[PDB]
Write a protein that binds this ligand. Structure first.
Ligand SMILES: *C(=O)/C=C/c1ccc(O)cc1
Length: 124
């Protein structure tokens, strides 16, 4: 898929893309509901983190999968965005739960329709 990390209209491009198409992206992509449950999780993300995508779909990202993100610096930003109904933030972070610590750039953006939220990830 021909989409760049951080693209201004990424929510339109990805809107309603199915799991197979998401697996074509150059960067990790996770779709979360407003509670942080995982709705979609692509192959590039699994390559970065070791998680098996179909296994983490339905789990809570903050509670279960990624406790290192349960902090004001990641989850706090996410929940503020869910509560506001608007989110577009980009920041670096280190992923380190049961994995070699890995520095990444994270872009969280509210999905176009409904109430879903993207978490995009690339190595830095
Ligand atoms: C910290 O616990 C981060 C873990 C993590 C981040 C992103 C993922 O897709 C999976 C686990």
């Amino acid at each position: 898929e021909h989409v760049a990390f951080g693209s201004e209209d990424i929510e339109n491009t990805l809107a309603k893309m199915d799991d197979g198409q998401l697996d074509g992206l150059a960067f990790g992509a996770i779709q979360l509901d407003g509670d942080g449950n995982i709705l979609q999780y692509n192959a590039a993300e699994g390559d970065i983190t070791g998680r098996d995508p179909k296994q983490v779909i339905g789990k809570n990202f903050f509670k279960d999968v990624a406790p290192c993100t349960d902090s004001p610096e990641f989850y706090g930003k996410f929940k503020e965005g869910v509560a506001s109904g608007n989110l577009n933030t980009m920041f670096e972070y280190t992923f380190d739960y049961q994995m070699t610590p890995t520095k990444v750039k994270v872009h969280m953006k509210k999905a176009l329709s409904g109430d879903s939220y993207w978490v995009f990830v690339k190595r830095v």
